[PDB]
Symmetry: D2
Subunit: 318 residues, 4 copies
Amino acid sequence: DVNTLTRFVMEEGRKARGTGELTQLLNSLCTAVKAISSAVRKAGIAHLYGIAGKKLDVLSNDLVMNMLKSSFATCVLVSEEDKHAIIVEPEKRGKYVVCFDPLDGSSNIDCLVSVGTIFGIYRKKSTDEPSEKDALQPGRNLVAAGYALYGSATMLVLAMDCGVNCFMLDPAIGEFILVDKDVKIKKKGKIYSLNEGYAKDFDPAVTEYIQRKKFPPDNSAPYGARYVGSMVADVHRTLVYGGIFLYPANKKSPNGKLRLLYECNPMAYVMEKAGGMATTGKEAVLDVIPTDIHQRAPVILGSPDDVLEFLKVYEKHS
Amino acid sequence: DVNTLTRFVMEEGRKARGTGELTQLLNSLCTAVKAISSAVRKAGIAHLYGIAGKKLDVLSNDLVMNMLKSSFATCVLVSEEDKHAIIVEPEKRGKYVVCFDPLDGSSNIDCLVSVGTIFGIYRKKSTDEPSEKDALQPGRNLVAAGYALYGSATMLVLAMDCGVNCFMLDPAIGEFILVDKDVKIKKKGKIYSLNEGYAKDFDPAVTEYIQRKKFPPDNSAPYGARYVGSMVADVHRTLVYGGIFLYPANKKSPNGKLRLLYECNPMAYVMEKAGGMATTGKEAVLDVIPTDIHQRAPVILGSPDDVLEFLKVYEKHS
Amino acid sequence: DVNTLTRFVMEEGRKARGTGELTQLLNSLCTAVKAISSAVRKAGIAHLYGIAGVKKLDVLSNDLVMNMLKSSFATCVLVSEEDKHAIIVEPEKRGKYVVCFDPLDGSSNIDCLVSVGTIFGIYRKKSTDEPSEKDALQPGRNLVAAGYALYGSATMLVLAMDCGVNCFMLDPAIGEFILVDKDVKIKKKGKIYSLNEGYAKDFDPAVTEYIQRKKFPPDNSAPYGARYVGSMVADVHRTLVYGGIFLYPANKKSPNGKLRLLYECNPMAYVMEKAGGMATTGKEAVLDVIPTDIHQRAPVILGSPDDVLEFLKVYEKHS
Amino acid sequence: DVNTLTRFVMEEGRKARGTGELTQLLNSLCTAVKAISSAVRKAGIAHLYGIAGKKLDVLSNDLVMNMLKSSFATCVLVSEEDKHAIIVEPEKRGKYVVCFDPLDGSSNIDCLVSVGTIFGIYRKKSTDEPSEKDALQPGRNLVAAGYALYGSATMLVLAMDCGVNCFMLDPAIGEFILVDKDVKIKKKGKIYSLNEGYAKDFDPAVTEYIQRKKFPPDNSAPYGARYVGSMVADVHRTLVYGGIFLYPANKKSPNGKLRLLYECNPMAYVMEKAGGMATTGKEAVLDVIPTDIHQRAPVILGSPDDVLEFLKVYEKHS
Ligand SMILES: O=P(O)(O)COc1cccc2c1-c1ncsc1C2
Ligand SMILES: O=P(O)(O)COc1cccc2c1-c1ncsc1C2
Ligand SMILES: O=P(O)(O)COc1cccc2c1-c1ncsc1C2
Ligand SMILES: O=P(O)(O)COc1cccc2c1-c1ncsc1C2
């Protein structure tokens, strides 16, 4: 029996016996994603080049922003594109807070590399007039999170308390088809992913770990290397093939480079629900209590046995 | 003045004042690429999942094969998917020979990583009955070559004697729109791309070069690292952002992993026409005279100053 | 504030405070319509013609609606022009709704690329017995929802419920039905009459006189314009948008008409009434006819109120 | 062997051994039709309705106009949209003249009725400066003509000296697939098409003919009636199913309502090449020598036996 994202979310929402808000929120996000996908695949670019005589990131942000506001399910929106959290006007407020990167990897879009949309959904915990403070909850409080990968094909990975599910976007009918139910990452992988250009600045623990991947002390087979540069792409490969992904702090970016609210937490949540791990080295990413909506955070995630191995090396250096 | 691949190829073909065969050949390939793109983006996948109640590689190979045969411009077809060269039936023979990888990076199409179609076109030099021998020409003989990148968006890079041009596929109207005329790679880049998992088996020259990229002896800024795993994707980034791409040889692989006829030469051709370089370490990729249609060849390509620097290190170890 | 069919139905469903079944049913139907639309516009036809080196559209359309409805868990009895007998949903997928539909109306003529569509009518099962064909035998007046999908120059879904009629345009770029017409109402009177005049020789005197009054206004007004696509979905939609009258009456050879009551007449009748129009068989409101056979025929005259009313006056003159 | 509009036109053009202009013109028209089709099916309408926070006929006219001008194959363009013929700037002139209706039936598009694009191509005869005079040639001089039907599916019917061919537009890959070679209309049909609302003003000949279709002389079965209102739709059904289409001159418009240059001639040309007929009642539509680019002309076309029958009745009343 075929299943779509819409049908899936409707059912899960019905079971929850709530207001139906989250269902509306996700429906809206889904529509936005479809819109972004169309734009990312360059639909209509011929008109831009004069067949008949705004930047992608901006448009993407506008789509998510507008669809979420018009859902009546949110009150506070935090986006990679905006400096301050956006407070939904009173007549359209809902109980959810959403953090997202409308178009991840958009900086290197020129080369047509994969790009994506990452999102994390929280329930407003505070009772004060909505404000940026409502977005400062530890990832552990996420009600739902996931991403949309705009690669060879467009896929939306949705993670909720009940697990992780993958939907393929069928461009023929603009419908997200469920193709992977209750997904689980491999216990251990054979791929490590990180920008080794920072080798000169790596922390000793990271240096040793990578070393153990290239020169297994047990003469096992060396891990293969892959690094697309687009977090959505790299994390998704990790989920599918297993392995490990890293963007640790550089002595140049002491607090890591990736953002906690809309890049780290969402991926961390997806990994954990899929049976994987996500650490900053010192603690689980999901446990970090944010103080600034755009704060950075180091992150090592992927197959449990792999993350655990890194942690062993991390401790050896602490 | 908007320009499409069809219009462009028709005009360049008209100027050549020939049979018009190459024009037909490229038109055919173009249609095939659009077909592949549709399939790659999962159009119709809902039917595969029972909405109404087997492989991409094979389908892609069938599309290029049939479109090329039906163009009446080819006589010998060499495909990464086929063990032997395909000899076009007599009643559909043309004067061109085409070598191609219908779906490059397909081994990893499961994580939705970018994939592409690489192609190289030669003119049959002999009148002997068409045979695999006609595909054994040095890349320097290429009449045209390029690739189709199925990434965030689908793009077709076409290189001919007159230069390199990039066309973006507008899904809305199924038309390839010219968006980059007479492209030229940067003289020097800041990105190095290769699977460092093979570090343990690297040739000393490769090891030292990568080391100079991570720890510049002149204390310059270290190069950034990127490696998608899909040649089309990696080479295209190199073209767009500049830098260097490597898939070198070592003791266990005296001649590399990538294939000369349909992976190395096409990319080598594109690079040279764009002002870049492509070496095997011992000589220009395009100068290698093939003896086997599926023979492998080591390859280092990209920005000239970068390839030249590699060659300096290579020589140091020779 | 942009609005989509999915958002709209979810909202209306939430307000109803029910099981959420109808919401799932409509979502499913909507997905099916998108699928049919894709097929109707010939997506992938290149493969059928050997680009790489395959059933009829009506069949496929029927399969899509059938499967999407069954898989919704909101239905128990499905009636389609395609199947002779009502389909009883297996026990593990039963819902409380009954659906009558024509998966691809006008399909008898898709070779000329004429407009085609999907008509649907939704009823609530009103029995405590094992689901059967009998549950589809309710007068149109019992409809909970009904409408159609028009596959014309663009694909549009007209949805009529107790709260009114709303039109959604299908944006192929994102596969989303965008609300472009809220609480639609047909014109009080139109200037277009639609029917196959080829059957002139067999027309009922009332029909003959009426058409005559449209071509030669007695009060010397301007004669009505004529339009007849042949595809009910197309002709009814034009009537809705431009007003006027549409007819497929009974004749000598066809005493009860040609169109089907359950999935062609009732749905359209329901849509017209909710939009302020009328739908009569000549003897009574289409919606009031109590069916006895799921595939029974019924004559139908529908459209602008003043126009249907005028026909009725002529009909009575001949009774 | 699959065949596309592009491949077909390139081959026929090559055989003609000419400048290649007509090939470029048709390619351009083809791309424009795809663009119009996308617009007609409402692609992107969501943005029009604020998903992210000009008229179809105008856009359609702009697309054809620009694509034709940029083909370098035209010099004089006549469109229903413009009052005066458009003279192509000197630096983009070709030897062809094109008359067209960018979006036929656009007046009643609000009901989603079928719409289409009609076109007629002539070769500039004269040697003087291009002017409106160059579009005043009898249909008999057409080099090519046809239309694009935007119905349940988009189809382009192309008629040239070698016959009539039909191409289905595959939205998945934006390619026109040849699905009907050297088409021929039925010798006689069973459908008559015309707006009977004008009954009160019909010419006696028309009245009698219609009468013979509803109450058959040879005891035969009455013809079925169909009238969409969109010429492109009605003419296409006639071509496919055979029969007759009429828009005669009543008492009011003594010259008919349809336009000769871009509505009647193109259709007339298509019919004749398909073995059908097209008369004004007094003479073959293609034989009428125009004096005004927007002049009207009565027209009765379709199956030969049907047109012939009309003519017999027409003469009885003359
Ligand atoms: O937002 P509400 O409708 O008040 C509650 O919705 C939920 C409460 C708990 C768990 C889930 C949902 C929910 N809504 C849609 S999917 C899903 C999973
Ligand atoms: O195949 P022919 O028409 O005989 C020769 O075509 C060419 C000969 C030389 C250079 C070019 C072409 C050609 N054909 C299409 S683009 C292009 C560039
Ligand atoms: O199927 P139920 O959820 O039990 C009842 O649904 C309804 C009951 C009355 C009115 C409406 C709906 C409904 N469901 C979706 S839109 C809409 C309008
Ligand atoms: O415009 P030219 O290439 O100089 C002449 O083209 C033709 C001359 C006669 C007949 C045909 C063509 C032509 N060009 C494309 S299809 C087709 C049929």
